Amino acid sequence: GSLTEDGLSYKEKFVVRSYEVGSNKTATVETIANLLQEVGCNHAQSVGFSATTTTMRKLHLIWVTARMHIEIYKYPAWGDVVEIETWCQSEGRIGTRRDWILKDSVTGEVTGRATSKWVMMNQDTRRLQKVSDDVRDEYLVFCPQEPRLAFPEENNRSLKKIPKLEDPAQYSMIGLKPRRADLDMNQHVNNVTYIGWVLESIPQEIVDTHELQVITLDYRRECQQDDVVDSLTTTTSNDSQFLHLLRLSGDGQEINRGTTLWRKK
């Protein structure tokens, strides 16, 4: 991969691997989620990062995902090359936004797009805070000045308020635990695991006859290595829509909430 000519975005090509595909022989949404994560890491490394700035490590501050939104028009097949372009943008003192565009390397058409909202948090106390002026200027040089939105639309699906699932849920997957493969280099559960865990409550019949089009996920609390999750789902709707909820098995503390949209094959 490499930065574009202006140095205000990064591109990377990935060949889809055999273990990265599902039953339809196309990449899973978790493979896509992993690829977006990977290109974001390479973008951060290519501009002198490790993505904590000078003032962030001084104050023990980290970026945390608050929301992920992914829309896929076509899933790349096993053996195909997918090109992903990623960039970041300041959202004032609220946090940062990271966008992605997925393309077929052969045709050059947009086969998917994603958007994420990141908030600043103290690594130790876990307390959210607004972006300071000294920190905002440190990352502003790596961002476009004019708005560059992967989801421009005057009423897009990425900004909708997600309601909380009411008990009883229509479908559920109980007793979900993360293994060492689910943890990142800092021993925290990878953000992509929550996506997989959310989808565990969707019935296998829907997965066999439908393709996942859109997924919106709100990250409320992190699941520890020794925590147990419960995935809950209810159909709300040629298109099926679901409301989702991930919570701790014990106290029932909410850790994630979201919605998915599926279309008939």
Add this chain to the structure above:
Amino acid sequence: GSLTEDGLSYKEKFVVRSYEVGSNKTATVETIANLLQEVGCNHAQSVGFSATTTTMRKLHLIWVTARMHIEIYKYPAWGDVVEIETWCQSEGRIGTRRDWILKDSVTGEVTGRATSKWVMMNQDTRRLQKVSDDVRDEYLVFCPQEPRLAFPEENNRSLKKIPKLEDPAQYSMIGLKPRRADLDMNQHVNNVTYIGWVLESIPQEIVDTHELQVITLDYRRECQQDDVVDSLTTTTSDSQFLHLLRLSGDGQEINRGTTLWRKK
């Protein structure tokens, strides 16, 4: 990736990804296991396959892993390029063997090696079958004639008989279930999940102070999508462990193995 000049092996370079590494910022043994699996698929595709031969698809026959053995000297770091060379060989009518050599793309040194024993099963009845001729000949053109062994040594770790763990186990991880990410394109639990599941019973204190050097795993039975596994471990000794994966209910054995760890 591509086949070598003689067409009797395949090579491929992989850049280690950020989500593929552990706390030491080096690739996990499951990332390595995934890479070996991937290079084996590309090798099979590059020589005209869909590794099912002509006779095999007519008879509803598949290759299944009976044994996996991996030895790592150095784990590639996040950002490093690892080159893997893989090849197949016949072992008479008992089955097939697949070997791998892992190398650092910069220095060219051997940083790891693996060997696997594959047996021929009937997809539907799940019944083991010996490798008859005709199907033996159909694939012997893609294999070296003289023995090419990643583990040559007479009396090496890859050929040792693994005993069955006795109850009670010293360490255990219970209630393990596969998710959709753990399944392959045919909806079967990926062989690499069993490796991860085996390692779930190793205490986090050993993982934090030791590096995994060798792992030998015997595949006895497949775990279904709706099955629940129990991972059991006992220290037998460098630290050495005896492992056992079994179904939560009936306690049916699905996998057994051993791991060797060195102090950091």
